[PDB]
Structure 1
């Protein structure tokens, strides 16, 4: 069974956390993870791209001129699509891009991403990110450098760990989330995943019970 040694920011070492095989030893599925990540990015997408159809463009109600006689092409509106300033035929309209990806697919993709991190030894556990009640990005940065040297790290800490969240949030590549919002997009985007001990235990309980 995979083990993660809890690292304290003090430099010493507390105990270890077991990583359930069903959660951190799953075989990554590239197609499944790609679908889940694409669905996440589609949900993130703000489909607020709009145009005006010929009926929505101002004016244009009247027929520009006679049907016959003028010697010009027949027009029914100065806002017809071919006209300059006319409506857009098949232009964008606001739309919701989110997808109803199955819960099992989403959870399996997240578990596969975390399993890949575990297999590559990219998962770390820490009692906390800084010692004390005052946040310190200096201390958080030193501790994260001790833990890993990769550019991007997903910091998974509890909501009440506001000290750690504030301490670590302004580091360039560090991304901070809670164990309940853990997701394959962030896990894959991050080279390492630094769980708090409380966050890791919460995730394991939520996914095992």
Structure 2
């Protein structure tokens, strides 16, 4: 159990959270994380790429000249693969790259990725990013700089939290993600994880039950 010190924009510590040993203390498995993060990237890649084969090129339906007597090579169309302008013989076709990864494999990847952050003291929890009902990224930038000095950070913010989300959007390295949509690739890509107190409890309660 890791005790995460909760902070506030005013700089006053509020309380503490207890990260479960199940979720935040798994031994990282590099071979398992690599398979998972490759699976998400493959699902990101859209297979919109195609070329017209010898059959789908416009024309070339007639034997251009006789079989015998001409003195040139035997040719069966004006669009065969060897021609200029002919079809593409083994070309790319539009295909989907998403692959089916078992639920237990995917979940265990996230636990390993999160457990790694907890060990090195990168997981932070914050009650709220800014003063309510008024977005202001100058305040959010000052807060985030106080917490972590690293270039990249990931902010887990509840879906209904809009002043926080719309405040830290514009920042260069900051990525914001809903606690339900937490995934391996995003977690590993971050130097830190800046949870929201309502989000951190929601994530913990979702799995621990």
Same fold, judged at TM 0.5 (above): yes
How far off is 1:169 after superposition? 1.1
Structure 2: how far apart are the matches of 1:158 and 1:25?
Answer: 24
C-alpha distance in structure 2 between counterparts of 1:207 and 1:68, whole Å = 76
Runs of 4 or more consecutive aligned structure 1 residues displaced over 2 Å after TM superposition: none
CA displacement, residues 79-133 of structure 1 (integer Å, 9 cap, x when unaligned): 1111111111111111100011111111000110000011111110000111121
Q: How far, CA to CA, are the matches of 2:53 and 2:208 in structure 1?
A: 52
The answer as to whether partners of 1:49 and 1:93 remain within 8 angstroms in 2 is yes
Q: CA deviation at 1:64?
A: 2.0
Match of 1:199 in 2: 199
Q: CA-to-partner distance for each residue in 1:60-82, whole Å, 9 max, x for gaps?
A: 11122222222222222211111
Alpha carbons 1:10, 1:131 under 8 Å: kept: no
Equivalent residue pairs, number: 209
Ranges in structure 1 where 5+ consecutive residues have no aligned partner: none
Name structure 2 gaps, 5 residues minimum.
none
Aligned partners of 1:65 and 1:141: how far apart in 2? Answer: 74
Secondary structure of residue in 1 paired with 2:163: helix
